[PDB]
Nucleic acid binder design. Structure first.
Ligand SMILES: [Ca+2]
Ligand SMILES: [Ca+2]
Length: 327
DNA sequence: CATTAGA
DNA sequence: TCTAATG
């Protein structure tokens, strides 16, 4: 967590670059298991050779470790950090819809800047074009103060359309977090669960409402269960407009909520941790269900859920108010 | 790890 | 179809 710090962070830098600027999936996979093993070690690494004892650690990375260790740096690490093209990719990627594939592709083409991107909006796709529009706005944080304004409205139409809908703005926000990056709306209906062969319109209906009132402004992607978009808070009695925000809304089988909900509500840890317990508690939790183990090795049989409660009751824990689901 | 666009 | 990108 700290005594191993420099090694890791270097290693990740190491990894991330391989997958990113190069195509090095493996070196990249190589680096990560290392900064993985190397992270777990309980003592200080005083030498490569020492590290090298590790699993996944080799001549390759040990050599790296000594140098890192000997002098406060690493050249390979230094040259990339300097590397124009490489920087370029790490940069372009920041764009909503740009990825390592596109990244590099763009780059070989001559497009290295935010401005480059503009002169050739043609070369970009709807996702990316949008992404281009709201680069600034997408990188911003989202004050909870707004989370609530956003939350409100949405819960607002959700209701108008159909009183029988259920939404839950999950994520960090949910968890009381001062600021969030994207609003995360989960959504279900009685009329849609397990077998009931959809009703895509279930999803569609809302999206329409939302735009209809001006909450929705663009569509990154729209599927019959997963809408992916851009929203905005009605820029008040002037002098103050609201930055465009990323939003996602998703359809779900009422028979699946609570877990679903539980899950996306995190924290990443809280989950893993509760989940670990469900194992002892003779269970299994996953993004959609809760099944009870069979000593045989594994088992099935989805236990029925009406709330975050059942899931608690099942594994015999203390219901954790989302506030404190941090770990 | 599943969903969407796209080409 | 496969492949890239978000989450
Ligand atoms: Ca080894
Ligand atoms: Ca990106």
């Amino acid at each position: 967590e700290t005594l191993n710090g420099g090694i890791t962070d270097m290693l990740t830098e190491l990894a991330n670059f391989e997958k990113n600027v190069s195509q090095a999936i493996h070196k990249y996979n190589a680096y990560r298991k290392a900064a993985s093993v190397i992270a777990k070690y309980p003592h200080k690494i005083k030498s490569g050779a020492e590290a090298k004892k590790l699993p996944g650690v080799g001549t390759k990375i040990a050599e790296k470790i000594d140098e890192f260790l000997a002098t406060g740096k690493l050249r390979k690490l230094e040259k990339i950090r300097q590397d124009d093209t490489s920087s370029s990719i790490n940069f372009l990627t920041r764009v909503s819809g740009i990825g390592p594939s596109a990244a590099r592709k763009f780059v070989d083409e001559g497009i290295k800047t935010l401005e480059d991107l503009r002169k050739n909006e043609d070369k970009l796709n709807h996702h990316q074009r949008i992404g281009l529009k709201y680069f600034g706005d997408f990188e911003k944080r989202i004050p909870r103060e707004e989370m609530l304004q956003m939350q409100d409205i949405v819960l607002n139409e959700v209701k108008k359309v159909d009183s029988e809908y259920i939404a839950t703005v999950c994520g960090s926000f949910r968890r009381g977090a001062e600021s969030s990056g994207d609003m995360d709306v989960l959504l279900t209906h009685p009329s849609f669960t397990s077998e009931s062969t959809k009703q895509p319109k279930l999803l569609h209906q809302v999206v329409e409402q939302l735009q209809k009132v001006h909450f929705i402004t663009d569509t990154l992607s729209k599927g019959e269960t997963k809408f992916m978009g851009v929203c905005q808070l009605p820029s008040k009695n002037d002098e103050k407009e609201y930055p465009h925000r990323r939003i996602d809304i998703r359809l779900i089988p009422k028979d699946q909520y609570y877990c679903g909900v539980l899950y996306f509500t995190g924290s990443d840890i809280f989950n893993k941790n509760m989940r670990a317990h469900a194992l002892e508690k003779g269970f299994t939790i996953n993004e959609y269900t809760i099944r009870p183990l069979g000593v045989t090795g594994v088992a099935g049989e989805p236990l029925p859920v009406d709330s975050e409660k059942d899931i608690f009751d099942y594994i015999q824990w203390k219901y954790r108010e989302p506030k404190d689901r941090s770990e």
